[PDB]
Amino acid sequence: LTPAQESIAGTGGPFPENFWDPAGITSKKSKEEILELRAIELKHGRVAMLAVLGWFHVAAGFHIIGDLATGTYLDNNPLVSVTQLPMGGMWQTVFFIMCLEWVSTYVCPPPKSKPWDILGWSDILLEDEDNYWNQFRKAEVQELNNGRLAMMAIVGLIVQDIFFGDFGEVKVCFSSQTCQDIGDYLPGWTGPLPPVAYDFPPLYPAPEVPYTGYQAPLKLM
Amino acid sequence: SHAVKIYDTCIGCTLCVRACPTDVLEMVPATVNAAKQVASSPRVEDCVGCKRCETACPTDFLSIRVYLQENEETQYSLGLDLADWS
Amino acid sequence: AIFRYVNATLWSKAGHFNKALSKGAKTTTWIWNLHASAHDFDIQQGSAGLIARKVFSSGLAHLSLVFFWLGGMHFHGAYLSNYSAWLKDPKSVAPSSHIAYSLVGQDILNSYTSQYFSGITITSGFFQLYRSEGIVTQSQLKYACAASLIATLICLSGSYLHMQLMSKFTSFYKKFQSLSQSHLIIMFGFGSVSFSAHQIHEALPINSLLDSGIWDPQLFSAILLGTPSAITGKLLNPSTGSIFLSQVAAHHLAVGIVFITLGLIKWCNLFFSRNAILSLRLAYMDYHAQLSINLAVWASLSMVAAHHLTEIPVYPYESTDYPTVLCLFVHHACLSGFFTVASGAHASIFVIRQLPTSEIRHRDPIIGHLIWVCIALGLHSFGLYCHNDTLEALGRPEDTFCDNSIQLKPIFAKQFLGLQPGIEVLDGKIVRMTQELGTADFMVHHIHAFTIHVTLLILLKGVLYARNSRLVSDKLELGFAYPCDGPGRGGTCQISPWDHLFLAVFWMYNCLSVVIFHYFWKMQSDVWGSYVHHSSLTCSHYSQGDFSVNSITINGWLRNLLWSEASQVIQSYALPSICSYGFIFLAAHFVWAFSLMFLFSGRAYWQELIESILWSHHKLKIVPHIQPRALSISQGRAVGLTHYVLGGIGCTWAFIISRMLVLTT
Amino acid sequence: ISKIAYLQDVPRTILEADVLEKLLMNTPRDQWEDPPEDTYLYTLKTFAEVYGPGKATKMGWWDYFRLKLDLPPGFELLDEDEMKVAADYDKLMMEGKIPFAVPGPAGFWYTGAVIQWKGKEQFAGDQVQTLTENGRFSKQFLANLAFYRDGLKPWQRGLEIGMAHGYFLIGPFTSLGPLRNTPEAATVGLLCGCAIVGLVSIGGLIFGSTIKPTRFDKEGDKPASGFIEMINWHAIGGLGGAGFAHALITVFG
Numbered sequence A: 001l002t003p004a005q006e007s008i009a010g011t012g013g014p015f016p017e018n019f020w021d022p023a024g025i026t027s028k029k030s031k032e033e034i035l036e037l038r039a040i041e042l043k044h045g046r047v048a049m050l051a052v053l054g055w056f057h058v059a060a061g062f063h064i065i066g067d068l069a070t071g072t073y074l075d076n077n078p079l080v081s082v083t084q085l086p087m088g089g090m091w092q093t094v095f096f097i098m099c100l101e102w103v104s105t106y107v108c109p110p111p112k113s114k115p116w117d118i119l120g121w122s123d124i125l126l127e128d129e130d131n132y133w134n135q136f137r138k139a140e141v142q143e144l145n146n147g148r149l150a151m152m153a154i155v156g157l158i159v160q161d162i163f164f165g166d167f168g169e170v171k172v173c174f175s176s177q178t179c180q181d182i183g184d185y186l187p188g189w190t191g192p193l194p195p196v197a198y199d200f201p202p203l204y205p206a207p208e209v210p211y212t213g214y215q216a217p218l219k220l221m
Numbered sequence B: 001s002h003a004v005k006i007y008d009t010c011i012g013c014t015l016c017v018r019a020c021p022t023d024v025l026e027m028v029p030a031t032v033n034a035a036k037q038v039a040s041s042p043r044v045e046d047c048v049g050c051k052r053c054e055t056a057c058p059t060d061f062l063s064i065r066v067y068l069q070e071n072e073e074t075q076y077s078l079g080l081d082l083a084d085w086s
Numbered sequence C: 001a002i003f004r005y006v007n008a009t010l011w012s013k014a015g016h017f018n019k020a021l022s023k024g025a026k027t028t029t030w031i032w033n034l035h036a037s038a039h040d041f042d043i044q045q046g047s048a049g050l051i052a053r054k055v056f057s058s059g060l061a062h063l064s065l066v067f068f069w070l071g072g073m074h075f076h077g078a079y080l081s082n083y084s085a086w087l088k089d090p091k092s093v094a095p096s097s098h099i100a101y102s103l104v105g106q107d108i109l110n111s112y113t114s115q116y117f118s119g120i121t122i123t124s125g126f127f128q129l130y131r132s133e134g135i136v137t138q139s140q141l142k143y144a145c146a147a148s149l150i151a152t153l154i155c156l157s158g159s160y161l162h163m164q165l166m167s168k169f170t171s172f173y174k175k176f177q178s179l180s181q182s183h184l185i186i187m188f189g190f191g192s193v194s195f196s197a198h199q200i201h202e203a204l205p206i207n208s209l210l211d212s213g214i215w216d217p218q219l220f221s222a223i224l225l226g227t228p229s230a231i232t233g234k235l236l237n238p239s240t241g242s243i244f245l246s247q248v249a250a251h252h253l254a255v256g257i258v259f260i261t262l263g264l265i266k267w268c269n270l271f272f273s274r275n276a277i278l279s280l281r282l283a284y285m286d287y288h289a290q291l292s293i294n295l296a297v298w299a300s301l302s303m304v305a306a307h308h309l310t311e312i313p314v315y316p317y318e319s320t321d322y323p324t325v326l327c328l329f330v331h332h333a334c335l336s337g338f339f340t341v342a343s344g345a346h347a348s349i350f351v352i353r354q355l356p357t358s359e360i361r362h363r364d365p366i367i368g369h370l371i372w373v374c375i376a377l378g379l380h381s382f383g384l385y386c387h388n389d390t391l392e393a394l395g396r397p398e399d400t401f402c403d404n405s406i407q408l409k410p411i412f413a414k415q416f417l418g419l420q421p422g423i424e425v426l427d428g429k430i431v432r433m434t435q436e437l438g439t440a441d442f443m444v445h446h447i448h449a450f451t452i453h454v455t456l457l458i459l460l461k462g463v464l465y466a467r468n469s470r471l472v473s474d475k476l477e478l479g480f481a482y483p484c485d486g487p488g489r490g491g492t493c494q495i496s497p498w499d500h501l502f503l504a505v506f507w508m509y510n511c512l513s514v515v516i517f518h519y520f521w522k523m524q525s526d527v528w529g530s531y532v533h534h535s536s537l538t539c540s541h542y543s544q545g546d547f548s549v550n551s552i553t554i555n556g557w558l559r560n561l562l563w564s565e566a567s568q569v570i571q572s573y574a575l576p577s578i579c580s581y582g583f584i585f586l587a588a589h590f591v592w593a594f595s596l597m598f599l600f601s602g603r604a605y606w607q608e609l610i611e612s613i614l615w616s617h618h619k620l621k622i623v624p625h626i627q628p629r630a631l632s633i634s635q636g637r638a639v640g641l642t643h644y645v646l647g648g649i650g651c652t653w654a655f656i657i658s659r660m661l662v663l664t665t
Numbered sequence D: 001i002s003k004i005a006y007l008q009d010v011p012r013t014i015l016e017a018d019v020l021e022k023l024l025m026n027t028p029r030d031q032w033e034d035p036p037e038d039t040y041l042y043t044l045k046t047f048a049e050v051y052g053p054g055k056a057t058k059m060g061w062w063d064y065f066r067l068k069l070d071l072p073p074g075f076e077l078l079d080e081d082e083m084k085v086a087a088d089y090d091k092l093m094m095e096g097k098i099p100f101a102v103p104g105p106a107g108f109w110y111t112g113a114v115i116q117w118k119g120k121e122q123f124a125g126d127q128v129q130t131l132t133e134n135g136r137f138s139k140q141f142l143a144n145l146a147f148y149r150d151g152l153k154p155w156q157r158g159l160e161i162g163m164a165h166g167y168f169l170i171g172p173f174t175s176l177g178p179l180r181n182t183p184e185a186a187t188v189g190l191l192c193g194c195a196i197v198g199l200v201s202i203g204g205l206i207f208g209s210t211i212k213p214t215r216f217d218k219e220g221d222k223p224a225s226g227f228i229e230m231i232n233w234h235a236i237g238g239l240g241g242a243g244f245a246h247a248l249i250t251v252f253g
Ligand code: CLA
Pocket: A008, A009, A010, A011, A012, A013, A014, A018, A019, A020, A021, A024, A025, A026, A034, A037, A038, A040, A041, A044, A147, A148, A149, A151, A152, A155, A159
């Protein structure tokens, strides 16, 4: 690596200790540029995690603010629900996020050393503590990996919805969806027993002619 | 503040002094009893009024009496912690 | 192992266990302290081995007591009950395994239950339990009673033996890994599997025959035979109005398998996050810590039982046996509350006797935010009721919070069963019906949350401020159960965890009374009742669906629930069935009022009155050398609390049971 | 260790070698000499002093059964990693650092972070650090509130606070008032909001007349002059904000 690249080493790749960079984008960058890239990555990852959460939440139904605002049940497809939502709510959402960004970037700007530290953890946190109960690196890598996966997932969901109208419908099966049957609950099921195409034969033959005091084996049927 | 008074029935067993939570009392030399000492109350300003001295007094009726004075309550007698009157 | 040291010599000492009782019987406070500290094995003479001995042997003795009680129940069912008439026709005949004497005209208590039987209608659901178990013969009930008595004798022998088998070296009670593994795999897993086996092999054929109508001895002495593919719980037995017992047996088999699997993965160490719980594992290896945790667990399980025994029907005909379901719910809710306050108490005791966990070091924010949430919850939830009352009195219903007026819709209260439209009925009664939630349900649920949070506030404050506080810094030295620290520092009354429980019990009782009233009124108004004729039925409910219209006001609660539904209990004197319930209503009112004596008064007045009275005894030469004394401060509080709770619970008990008995008969 | 007589050549039947090693590791070193009465090591000492080589080589079946019942198995005692984790936890707490956790459903999760629980003043309970109040974001936000913002005159502080207060205060009466359905709902709500602003400003004037805070006062000025100015301008700003909200409601329906 390089002195600039080391500013984020240990928080990337499949294992934390790797540095995945096939394009070599960060090879020539300076430490400030690397920190800004990490800040962009973390902001995108967090926004993508929240976006996937909300996307699945609205695709399961559960879209009450929109339902009440429009006086009607909005389409489960989130991209359709965006258009179904009132401009009032849309501009309110945009304005609220704008206010959050303004506060986070002008009133309470994160430190230049940790541009991703929005909540100001690096004023009471002790990252360089040699205790066992100091898995902040684990927490950071979990955050980054989940955020990257959520970025890919949300982009895929949006692209698939735009192309084939498939929004990754969720089958929560409890409140918005009324599942009447065991087959509805578990695919391929039609009865109490699992849908196995194997008829379990008797391990031992039975007597064709019984005798007093037999007690033939019971059948689950 | 409360009024902690000591009467000559005192036998100087020191139990009041040992039970004091804020060290209001102290044994002083005397000739009235066989133990040759009687409890005193010099730091009555710190008395909170818990009557633990009174609980620990052996005599038939107490040789130490704590008279509560709610009108003259001070921060020391109230055990104020979060607020300061000093 | 050495049984030569167990002699009846100590029986007459009466206080040997406590060293503080050595100066025997100088006053009546000595008697009261003897009773109070009888079972406080920790502070008694001996060693830790003796403490463990006493704890385990007492647990076994109580096990024997419970087995004796169950055997008595079985015997009463067998010989002093109309179980035969109930089994052949449950609807017509009310359960009754309880008969009263004809001493002073007391035969009036017995009421018509069957043609040949007269007695007191039981509300424990024991008949339904027997029917589910497949017990259909007096011989079977008699052998169940014999088994219960044998278990009682075995447990008594085990307690007596373990009082000496366990020595100071004994450590089997400290093997928490072994204890938990054994309980999880054998007591729970194997137990559930074995009970599923019992159901499949005994109860399923008998119950199927009973549903069909067959009562043949040869038959009484092919799983999934009648159950369709419908999800369990989505289809109730049309002829019984309860979940299929084959589904119940499959449930128990699955639960046992799951418990065995959990135990085996724990055995193999598959669970990995041991460190997250290691702190609790090290801290809570204490008698009182385990007692508190277990009491809370069983309180929560009792509350879940109270809810499920009614909402989810599994016993035959218990759904239509309205007194039974109501009494089961109320009883288990009360037990939940009592065991929760118990968990708080023993958490406080553990904090006093052992080192607390580190969440006690920021206790001020915790209790401060709990205080704020309690205040806000109470304000909003109860002030909605007060607003409704004031506005309705002023004559502005449009300004109140109700379904017709401003409405607080419970948006989050969403279905999960996915049941089909309609209701389930069985012989002129509504076995199952969906509860429709509105503004009244919103308000009452937030009242529930408020009361729960205030009780939790009291318990948590007692637990966290047990060792010390800003007021008094040596509360640990003071101990667990002391009345105060003195009139000083303004006054330190009821600063002890014992007194914190003494108040949390009042608040738990208030919460549970509101819960009982909510359940009772909602079920009467919106669930229970009869029906009058694809077919559509008009459902005539016992309370006539007045919960949603009248429950929005405290006046509505006072009038439509207490006054209106107290007609049965208040007018029960002439009626043979419920005259006892009316008398118990009156007597419980008396006891509750009598508790206020101890709750309001103080020790010194009674001590001075006792001395003035004793003057006359001394004058006449009646000198009691166990000098009479007024009850201690803590004892007065305990007596007042006990009488208060008992009186309130008795009034509610008689009121609800009288109403249900009269309405159903 | 070799210096301990009863720990020498303990027979395998009484206690396995591995379990004995684990028990010794778990027990504090100082207790090996003479362990307390209620400990596995005490039981082992008492029974090894009586049984083993050169002593009773046999035991009754029941006595041996009880001995194996009351001696510890290997899995009952803590492991090396578990003891290390517990020691690290205790060391952190005693050093004044807190392995951060947030309460969850009937429990609390560990976030993997170590914070500095104790503040600059170690004995001060006001200064214990928390992200809510002592984090960088919270510090900046609170410092940038109007009450605290740097380079603000008291009239500016009061005007901004009152603008906010009146603007949000008019709404509750407008929407949920007795005359909420009448055509004058907005105006009546504006009147009620202005009344509330006036009442709170009167309360603030009482506060500044009685306690007389002097944090906003200019040098060489009457005490509480800055606070009273801020409260008067809060009343003005509340009137203005209530009027602006009412105007917006009226104009845009
Ligand atoms: C906002 C997006 C974003 C940003 C700013 C970064 C930034 C960073 N990542 Mg990357 N990363 C992202 C998303 C992003 N990542 C995603 C979604 C994944 C999952 C595949 C990863 C997986 C990943 C790993 C495994 C590692 C990094 C690492 C890094 C750092 C060094 C490598 C580099 O130069 O990356 C710069 C990245 C970019 C400039 C993004 C370029 C994207 C191109 C233009 C393609 C975009 C197309 C996309 C598929 C969308 C198409 C949609 C359309 C069809 C509609 C750097 C801070 C390394 C690290 O932290 O080492 C310590 C590291 O090891 N990242």
